């Protein structure tokens, strides 16, 4: 009595509706610290003349 | 994923049996382990679960004061004290697997558990 477990299961069955149905969720999150940007994009090139 | 049950059988009222079920088979997780017992002609009943995190304990009325169930984890196993045996403690009885966690104990006297035992006999004499 007023002692519970603070975690509880998904019900995530095949049958589920969408909003109960699971959902994989990715958050990127970018940092910059005093500290060299080691993470860059593409940036592609072009031919030479 | 198999439940491996053994010990009880046959005991003179007043005694004391340990029954033990261990856990075979790749598990992702265990959320709580039960023991039910089924005596002849009658429905399967409720005895007792516990956490398998924190080890909390859940008890039916009817063996309250008498029955202990304790986990082992690194073992993957669940056992039921019988204690101060009694002739209405003949049953079979059976170890039960869920991994469904809920935040109340309680929950796990109902709820329908995903694996189940073999089943072992335990039997009080006079």
């Known amino acids: 009595f007023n002692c519970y477990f603070p975690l509880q299961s998904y019900g995530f069955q095949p049958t589920n509706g969408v909003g109960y149905q699971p959902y994989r969720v990715v958050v990127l999150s970018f940092e910059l610290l005093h500290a060299p940007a080691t993470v860059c994009g593409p940036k592609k090139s072009t031919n030479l003349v | 994923v198999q439940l491996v049950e053994s010990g009880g059988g046959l005991m003179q009222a007043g005694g004391s049996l340990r029954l033990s079920c261990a856990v075979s088979?790749?598990?992702?997780?265990?959320?709580?382990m039960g023991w039910f017992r089924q005596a002849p002609g009658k429905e399967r009943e409720f005895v007792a679960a516990?956490?398998?995190?924190?080890?909390?304990?859940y008890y039916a009325d009817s063996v309250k004061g008498r029955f202990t169930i304790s986990r082992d984890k690194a073992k993957n196993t669940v056992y039921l004290q019988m204690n101060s045996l009694k002739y209405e403690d003949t049953a079979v009885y059976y170890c039960?697997?869920?991994?469904?966690?809920?935040?109340?104990?309680?929950?796990?006297?109902?709820?329908?558990?995903?694996?189940w035992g073999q089943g072992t006999q335990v039997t009080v004499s006079s």
């Open positions: 088979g790749r598990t992702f997780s265990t959320a709580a």
């Open positions: 516990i956490r398998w995190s924190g080890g909390s304990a």
């Open positions: 039960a697997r869920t991994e469904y966690v809920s935040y109340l104990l309680s929950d796990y006297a109902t709820w329908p558990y995903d694996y």
